[PDB]
Amino acid sequence: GMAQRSILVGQIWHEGHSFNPILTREKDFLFLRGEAVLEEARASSTALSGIVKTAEALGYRCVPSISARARPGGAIEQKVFDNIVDEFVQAARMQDFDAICLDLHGATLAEHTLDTEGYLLSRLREVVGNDIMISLALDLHAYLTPQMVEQATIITSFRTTPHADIEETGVRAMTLLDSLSNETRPPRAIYSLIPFLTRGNDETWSGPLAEIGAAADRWRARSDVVDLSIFNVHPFLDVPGYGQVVLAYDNGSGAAIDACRDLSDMLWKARDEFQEQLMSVDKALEIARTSRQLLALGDQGDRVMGAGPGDSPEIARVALEHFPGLKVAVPVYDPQAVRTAREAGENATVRMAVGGAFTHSVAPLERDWTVRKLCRARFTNIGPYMAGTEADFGDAAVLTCDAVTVIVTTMAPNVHDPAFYEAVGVPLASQQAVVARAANHYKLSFADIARTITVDTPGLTAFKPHQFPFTQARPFYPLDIVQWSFAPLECNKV
Ligand SMILES: [Zn+2]
């Protein structure tokens, strides 16, 4: 037809954990619909922002479906996930569009649906058919499945950890889609599963991913590679077809197989390089005790950014027991503690076990807690990571005992930014160490005001596969000693 071309756009952001017993609920989501989806995209720096800004700079009209963002955590309540998909499907019916370009995480998880993105693509194709193009921007932590490869025209992921190319990945999803406009066929896809999980040393600026990322850039610079991505799968999913994935696209007779071979072999060779020795909590708290600079401690074992619950009071425990007088603040998921605190009121002292209700691996911390402040854990992230984005971890109580402050929260405490501490009235200057529930994504946000050390704590996000009852994920390395060699799936062979 003759009319301006339009692109259907939308977003889902959620990362799951098969071993977090706390379901992600409707409350945990921010939803936008209609034009508001596009207004937010233009004012932000997500992959969706990239998709929408690029589509509009290129002359396309963008048509909204919805956007749905919830912090990482347990599987989404199935009904809520079903309602999200239905809103996508309905937008796919009601609207006029010539192609679809979406910002999805790739490791969203629902209580019954294990491959959520794959499922979403199928439901959309039920309504839109197999001719129109669908392009995805994905997080590199995606659980990338054969169904996804089969149901999408093209897929591209982040290339940095910590994730600093989020928007650019969106730009590229849309640019790739636009580039395919005159093609008489979809591009050929080569999928390769390398059956191991990473256990740290997984940043892209140094370590094994720097070499592998360099090789990847050279492959993509060839005129006979359309694109390629490397997925370091989120390592807390009990799902089949599990491991690292290399995904490459060409015109049917380019280098997608060679690229995928080279990179799969490098990842395999490097499988035991993805390990680290994090500093102990005792050593880190002793640096804090002897430093003028604030310490910001990444609680590796209980990261909400790794879809953990954030109920570990462990760092508070060690501070209390081994460093009396050391001023440490820790954010802890404990909705009951909040409610107990709210009933006692500000200024009361209550004997109470805080934290540890959800992570089997750490004990609740029981003390005479004084309730210094009741307030809402609502604030704006300074960033860089998620700069400008508003957060709300629910009703909160700031609790003290000896020199330790525990801020208990009603919703998952995705603390990766200094604004949290200021918003709940625990000023950073007042502490010698504070806790971030992230390993990599808090560092830039605290770089200017703290020494950042990620510490070797226990819990549901420790890089210890042997601690989890993986069932349908197995076999994978390190748990199983498997004899892998390159064996790709090919899709849209020409
Ligand atoms: Zn990620």
Automatic annotation (TrEMBL):
<dbReference type="GO" id="GO:0046872">
    <property type="term" value="F:metal ion binding"/>
</dbReference>
<comment type="similarity">
    <text>Belongs to the peptidase M81 family.</text>
</comment>
<protein>
    <recommendedName>
        <fullName>Microcystinase C</fullName>
    </recommendedName>
</protein>
<feature type="binding site">
    <location>
        <position position="163"/>
    </location>
    <ligand>
        <name>Zn(2+)</name>
    </ligand>
</feature>
<feature type="domain" description="Microcystin LR degradation protein MlrC N-terminal">
    <location>
        <begin position="7"/>
        <end position="288"/>
    </location>
</feature>
<keyword id="KW-0479">Metal-binding</keyword>
<dbReference type="GO" id="GO:0008237">
    <property type="term" value="F:metallopeptidase activity"/>
</dbReference>
<dbReference type="GO" id="GO:0006508">
    <property type="term" value="P:proteolysis"/>
</dbReference>
<feature type="binding site">
    <location>
        <position position="139"/>
    </location>
    <ligand>
        <name>Zn(2+)</name>
    </ligand>
</feature>
<dbReference type="InterPro" id="IPR010799">
    <property type="entry name" value="MlrC_C"/>
</dbReference>
<keyword id="KW-0378">Hydrolase</keyword>
<comment type="function">
    <text>Involved in peptidolytic degradation of cyclic heptapeptide hepatotoxin microcystin (MC).</text>
</comment>
<dbReference type="Pfam" id="PF07171">
    <property type="entry name" value="MlrC_C"/>
</dbReference>
<dbReference type="Pfam" id="PF07364">
    <property type="entry name" value="DUF1485"/>
</dbReference>
<feature type="binding site">
    <location>
        <position position="141"/>
    </location>
    <ligand>
        <name>Zn(2+)</name>
    </ligand>
</feature>
<keyword id="KW-0862">Zinc</keyword>
<dbReference type="InterPro" id="IPR015995">
    <property type="entry name" value="MlrC_N"/>
</dbReference>
<feature type="domain" description="Microcystin LR degradation protein MlrC C-terminal">
    <location>
        <begin position="298"/>
        <end position="471"/>
    </location>
</feature>
<keyword id="KW-0482">Metalloprotease</keyword>
<dbReference type="InterPro" id="IPR009197">
    <property type="entry name" value="MlrC"/>
</dbReference>
<keyword id="KW-0645">Protease</keyword>
